[PDB]
Design a protein around this ligand. Structure first.
Ligand code: HEM
Ligand SMILES: CC(=O)[C@H]1CC[C@H]2[C@@H]3CCC4=CC(=O)CC[C@]4(C)[C@H]3CC[C@]12C
Length: 440
C-alpha cells in the first residue's frame, strides 16, 4: 500500500509551492503522492515523517535523482550535493566536511569577523542612505566562503569582483524556469532554449576559476600544512581524485553565498516589522558589552532564539533537495519502492501547529535550548555541509550589525514579508532597501 495519491499536474505552477503542499495535508495527511511535473513523487510535510525517513531510515532515502541538469553541471563529474548515495560519495562528503571543520578550525572565526567588520565600515560610507542590503549580504557571504576555500590571493589579486559575478550567474541560470523545465519534462531538451546555452557558458568558468585555483594551490602546497579548505582537500586525495575536490569547492562556493545572504536579509525584514525585538536585542548586547565571540553565544539567548525563528519561519532552502530511495522501504506505514523521488517540504513542516503553536507568527520567545527543533538544514546523511559555518555567519554578522547600527525602513512604508511566488531552490524576498543609522 503506497501513500495516497493527490490528483493533478503540474502542481509546480502553484504560486507558493511549499505552502500549497502544506494545504494538501488537510485532506491527504502528512505523507502523500502527487505529480510534480510529469513525474510521480512523494512529499513529506511533518518533522516526524522527515525524521523517520532521513534519521531513522538513514540509508533508505540518502540518494539523489539524476535529471539532465545534474549531468549538465558536472559532465566531468562528480558532484557532492547532487551525487547519488554510494560508498565513494560518503568518502567524498567526509573529506570536505573535514576541510570545513579541521582544515579551517582556526581562521573560520577571524576571517568571518574581519570581513563583517569591513562590511560595517563599508556601510558607514553614507549613513541614512537607501541600501540594497541583499547585494551587500551576498558580497559578504561570498567573500567569506571564497577566502576560506581559496585563501589570501582573493583580495591580493583582487578576484572578488569576477568571482562574485560568476558565482551569482551560475545559480541565477540554473535555478531559472528555463533549464529547470527540462528536468521536469525531459523531452524539451531537444527544443531550442536560451538558458541552457547561457548555463554552459557559465559552467566553463566556474570551471576555469576553480581549476586555476586548484593548480595554484598545488604549486606552493606544503605537506602537513593548510592555509585554506583546498589545501586540506588536495592532501586527502590523489579513489578520491582531484575532480572530487573541484566539485567540492563548487558546492561550497554556490551553496554558501545566496543561502546565508538571504537568511540574513529575512532576519532584517522581520526585525523591521518588529522594533520590539530589535530594541530587546540591542538591550541584550549592551550588557554583555568589544565583539562578543562565538565561544560565548549563550550570553545572548534571545539572539539565538531570533536566528532560530528566521530559520524556522523562512527556511532559505524550503523544499530541501530531492531525495531518491536506495532500497525498498516504508515511511509512516506506507510502502515506498526503490527509485521513488522524495521532497522534504521543510517550510511546510515548520508550520505544523501541533509542534509549534501560533505557527505563522514571528515569535523568538518561543525558543526561550527550549522545546522542539526545526530543520532548515535538513537531517540525516544529506544534512547541509555548511551548517557550522552558516550558523557562525548568522551570529557574527547580526551581532556586529545590531550593535553599531539601527535598522530603519528605506521608504515611509514597510517591506513585504511575502516571498515572491515562482521560487526555485532558494526562498527569496521581494527586493527591498534598508536604512542604516549609526549607534544601536
Ligand atoms: C543558513 C543557511 C543555509 C541553509 C538554510 C542551508 C540549507 C540546506 C539544505 C536544506 C540542504 C539540503 C538537505 C537535504 O537534501 O535533505 C543543504 C545542502 C547543502 N548545503 Fe546548505 N544551507 C545553508 C548554508 C550553506 C553553506 C554556508 C554551505 C557551504 C559553505 C552550504 C552547502 C551545502 C551543500 C554542499 C549541500 C549539499 C550536501 C548534500 O547533498 O549532502 N550550505 N543546505
Ligand atoms: C542547498 C542549496 O541551495 C545549494 C547547495 C549545493 C548547491 C548546488 C551545487 C552544485 C551546482 C552547480 C552548478 O553549476 C549549478 C548550481 C548547483 C546545482 C548548486 C545550486 C544550489 C545548491 C543546491
Amino acid at each position: 500500500k503506497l501513500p495516497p495519491l493527490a490528483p493533478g499536474f503540474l502542481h509546480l505552477l502553484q504560486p507558493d509551492l511549499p505552502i500549497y503542499l502544506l494545504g494538501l495535508t488537510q485532506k491527504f495527511g502528512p505523507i502523500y503522492r502527487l505529480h510534480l511535473g510529469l513525474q510521480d513523487v512523494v512529499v513529506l510535510n511533518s518533522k516526524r515523517t522527515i525524521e523517520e525517513a532521513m534519521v531513522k531510515k538513514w540509508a533508505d532515502f540518502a540518494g539523489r535523482p539524476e535529471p539532465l541538469t545534474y549531468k549538465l553541471v558536472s559532465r566531468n563529474y562528480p558532484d557532492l550535493s547532487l551525487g547519488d548515495y554510494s560508498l565513494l560519495w560518503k568518502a567524498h562528503k567526509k573529506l570536505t566536511r573535514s576541510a570545513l571543520l579541521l582544515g579551517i578550525r582556526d581562521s573560520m572565526e577571524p576571517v568571518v569577523e574581519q570581513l563583517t567588520q569591513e562590511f560595517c565600515e563599508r556601510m558607514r560610507a553614507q549613513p541614512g542612505t537607501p541600501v540594497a542590503i541583499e547585494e551587500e549580504f551576498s558580497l559578504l557571504t561570498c567573500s567569506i566562503i571564497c577566502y576560506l576555500t581559496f585563501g589570501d590571493k582573493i583580495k591580493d589579486d583582487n578576484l572578488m569582483p569576477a568571482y562574485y559575478k560568476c558565482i551569482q550567474e551560475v545559480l541565477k541560470t540554473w535555478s531559472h524556469w528555463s533549464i529547470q523545465i527540462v528536468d521536469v519534462i525531459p523531452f524539451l531538451r531537444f527544443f531550442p532554449n536560451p538558458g541552457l546555452r547561457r548555463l554552459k557558458q557559465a559552467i566553463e568558468k566556474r570551471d576555469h576559476i576553480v581549476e586555476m585555483q586548484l593548480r595554484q594551490h598545488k604549486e606552493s602546497l606544503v605537506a602537513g600544512q593548510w592555509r585554506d579548505m583546498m589545501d586540506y582537500m588536495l592532501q586527502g586525495v590523489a579513489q578520491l581524485l582531484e575532480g572530487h575536490v573541484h566539485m567540492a569547492a563548487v558546492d561550497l562556493l554556490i551553496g554558501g553565498t545566496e543561502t546565508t545572504a538571504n537568511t540574513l536579509s529575512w532576519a532584517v525584514v522581520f526585525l523591521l516589522h518588529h522594533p520590539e525585538i530589535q530594541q530587546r536585542l540591542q538591550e541584550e548586547l549592551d550588557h554583555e558589552l568589544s565583539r562578543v565571540p562565538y565561544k560565548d553565544r549563550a550570553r545572548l539567548p534571545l539572539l539565538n532564539a531570533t536566528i532560530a525563528e528566521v530559520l524556522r519561519l523562512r527556511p532559505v532552502v524550503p523544499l530541501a533537495l530531492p531525495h531518491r530511495t536506495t532500497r525498498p522501504s516504508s515511511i509512516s506505514g506506507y510502502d515506498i519502492p526503490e527509485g521513488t523521488v522524495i521532497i522534504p517540504n521543510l517550510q511546510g513542516a515548520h508550520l505544523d501547529e501541533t509542534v509549534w503553536e501560533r505557527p505563522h507568527e514571528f515569535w523568538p520567545d518561543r525558543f526561550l535550548g527550549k522545546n522542539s527543533r526545526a530543520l532548515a538544514f535538513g537531517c540525516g546523511a544529506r544534512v547541509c555541509l555548511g551548517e557550522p559555518l552558516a550558523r557562525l555567519e548568522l551570529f557574527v554578522v547580526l551581532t556586529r550589525l545590531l550593535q553599531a547600527f539601527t535598522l530603519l525602513p528605506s521608504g515611509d512604508a514597510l517591506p513585504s514579508l511575502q516571498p515572491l511566488p515562482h521560487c526555485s531552490v532558494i526562498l527569496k524576498m521581494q527586493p527591498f532597501q534598508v536604512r542604516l543609522q549609526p549607534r544601536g
